Write a protein that binds this DNA or RNA. Structure first.
Length: 52
RNA sequence: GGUGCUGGAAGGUUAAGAGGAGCGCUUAGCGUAAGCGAAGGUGCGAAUUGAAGCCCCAGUAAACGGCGGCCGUAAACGGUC
């Protein structure tokens, strides 16, 4: 989000699953079915690295 | 992919020619009536064989030939026929 950007494990139900955009479709094409190797930070900056 | 060219019969379509089943027409004669009829002669000839070629399978574009549309996103990428 431009003001509310965050990364956390949510617990509430984010409803209205509308028709997915093309970034979500490419994520389901490329990422789904895989495993997560490690979650590490690029130094001390606000950069999150996900190893899939 | 289609058409040309080259190669390949696994499988169908295959002509003429071989092949002759069988079915008509005549009658020596059996028959009260209408029909049946051997041997010949004379027409129609069904099955079975019978190559190239065609359907088919591959390659070949300095062979013939062709190289598209809609909607987004900033040539390029994404969705669909």
């Amino acid at each position: 989000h431009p003001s509310y950007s965050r990364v956390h494990i949510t617990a509430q139900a984010y409803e209205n699953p509308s028709e997915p955009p093309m970034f979500c479709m490419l994520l389901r094409k490329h990422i789904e079915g895989g495993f997560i190797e490690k979650i590490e930070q690029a130094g001390l900056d606000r950069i999150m690295i996900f190893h899939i």
